Structure 1
Amino acid sequence: GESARSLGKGSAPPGPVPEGSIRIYSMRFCPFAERTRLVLKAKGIRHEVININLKNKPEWFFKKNPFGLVPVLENSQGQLIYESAITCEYLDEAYPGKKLLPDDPYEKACQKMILELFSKVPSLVGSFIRSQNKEDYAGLKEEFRKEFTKLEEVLTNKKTTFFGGNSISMIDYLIWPWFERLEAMKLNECVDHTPKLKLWMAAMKEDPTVSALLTSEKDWQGFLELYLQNSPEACDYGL
């Protein structure tokens, strides 16, 4: 729908969040905000979405988050929560349904330590934007392969389908958005020496939550070409 169109500079500040719902301030192609949206879907949390034009931001958005970044949660009480991992943790704790983080303190620390193993991967997206030719591409693929070997080791040791066990859990949703984008970045071959990680991607794409939120390669390319041309229209690609 046009209902998903972003609010940008000059938009009216939105009204209060209705009792019984939580609001996410998101952007449809942002992988950090996708984390929060995977959790909202996986736990069956009633919510509304406000997309932000990250090239043409409303000044009122800095009242939601002084950093000016998505995702942000806002509840009916007016409380604001930001930073992707903090939003996810908050939702798992505040709402009923599937516990995505273990109750056991050690197993919960393990999920966070895996998140730490992953922590170099997002900054590699800036690396991808600065890659201009085949030489830069070869070096970019090597950087992805050395982070991916760290994740392969965890699956080798656990011999589980997923990073937190045989059931999908929080850590899987927290890293998935970057794996979702590998095909579109032409980095799919970075998982070819990481066989368990490659099977984990196939298992993720079968998860009902993942499948319900997955964006096509054509849609992510439309976004990236406008985001790279510096277009105020990038966030609204397709609408």
Structure 2
Amino acid sequence: GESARSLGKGSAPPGPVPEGSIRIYSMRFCPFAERTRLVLKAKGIRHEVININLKNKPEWFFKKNPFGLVPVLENSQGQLIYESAITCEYLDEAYPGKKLLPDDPYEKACQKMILELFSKVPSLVGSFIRSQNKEDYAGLKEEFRKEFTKLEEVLTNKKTTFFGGNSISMIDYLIWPWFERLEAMKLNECVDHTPKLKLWMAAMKEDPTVSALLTSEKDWQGFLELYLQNSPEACDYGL
């Protein structure tokens, strides 16, 4: 439990990444970094995690990513890779095991097109934070439904359980972390008129990788409570 505690302002910069492992600079409740962690787990990649206190960042972390954002991968050769979708594609290419992206140029482009379709959803988390009452909440639900109908159309067209076929693949993991938090946001009704999307969510929760990393509603709310209180302890909720 204690080894997961975040590194913040004044922490010593970590040592080199050992041969045979890759490191991810992450935060336990960041959906972008969850993408990378899903991919690490799905591909069976040996790794270490350093959590970053994003409310109280170490100065040395800007040497890992000049933008100060997680996720960041660092390997034994000293190479640094950031931007969540880039870290995921890098891992899929650089490591053996289950290929998460198809080899076919067209089918890979399709996955990336679905990812572009999804692009408005992460910024609706900001809309969620700024929603203060029942009227804001009604409008927010409508904003989520609008985006979710687009994803429903993809699953209708394909007639598969997942966004890349009948097997879980990269695209599913790239979109999953925002769906993971719907119940905690009280936005689970927004999939009510998207039945294929609703079944997709149930199938995702049964995926061994997703299940291994899933954070409970209570933990989501614990984190959120502290994060909106602007606590430097938010990132270490539950330790």
Deviation at 1:103, TM superposition (A): 0.3
Provide Cα deviations, 1:17-48, integer angstroms capped at 9, x if missing partner: 00000000000000000000000000000000
Determine the C-alpha separation between the residues in 1 that align with 2:221 and 2:147: 24
Provide Cα deviations, 1:175-194, integer angstroms capped at 9, x if missing partner: 00000000000000000000
Determine the C-alpha separation between the residues in 1 that align with 2:179 and 2:188: 8
Determine the C-alpha separation between the residues in 1 that align with 2:185 and 2:154: 25
Deviation at 1:132, TM superposition (A): 0.2
Determine the C-alpha separation between the residues in 2 that align with 1:47 and 1:139: 41
Deviation at 1:159, TM superposition (A): 0.4
Provide Cα deviations, 1:129-177, integer angstroms capped at 9, x if missing partner: 0000000000000000000000000000100010000000000000000
Aligned to 1:219: 219
Deviation at 1:67, TM superposition (A): 0.4
Deviation at 1:227, TM superposition (A): 0.4
Determine the C-alpha separation between the residues in 2 that align with 1:124 and 1:206: 26
Determine the C-alpha separation between the residues in 1 that align with 2:3 and 2:218: 21
Determine the C-alpha separation between the residues in 2 that align with 1:83 and 1:119: 14
Determine the C-alpha separation between the residues in 2 that align with 1:103 and 1:219: 37
Deviation at 1:117, TM superposition (A): 0.5
Determine the C-alpha separation between the residues in 2 that align with 1:204 and 1:66: 34
Provide Cα deviations, 1:80-115, integer angstroms capped at 9, x if missing partner: 000000000000000000000000000000000000
RMSD over aligned CA atoms reads: 0.3
SS in 2 for 1:55: coil
SS in 2 for 1:24: strand
Q: How many residues align?
A: 239
Deviation at 1:231, TM superposition (A): 0.3
Q: TM-score of the superposition, structure 1-length normalised?
A: 1.00
Determine the C-alpha separation between the residues in 1 that align with 2:132 and 2:183: 18
What fraction of aligned residue pairs are identical, expressed as a percent?
100
Deviation at 1:8, TM superposition (A): 0.1
Aligned to 2:36: 36
- Structure 2 unaligned runs (5+)? none
Q: Which aligned runs of 4 or more in structure 1 are off by greater than 4 angstroms? A: none
Deviation at 1:219, TM superposition (A): 0.4
Aligned to 1:235: 235
Kindly report which structure 2 residues correspond to 1:10-21, keeping only aligned pairs within 5 A, or say none: 10-21=10-21
Determine the C-alpha separation between the residues in 1 that align with 2:119 and 2:162: 18
Provide Cα deviations, 1:189-239, integer angstroms capped at 9, x if missing partner: 000000000000000000000000000000010000100000000000011
SS in 1 for 2:197: helix
Determine the C-alpha separation between the residues in 1 that align with 2:64 and 2:226: 26
Determine the C-alpha separation between the residues in 2 that align with 1:228 and 1:33: 20
Kindly report which structure 2 residues correspond to 1:96-111, keeping only aligned pairs within 5 A, or say none: 96-111=96-111
SS in 1 for 2:183: coil
Aligned to 2:173: 173
- Structure 1 unaligned runs (5+)? none
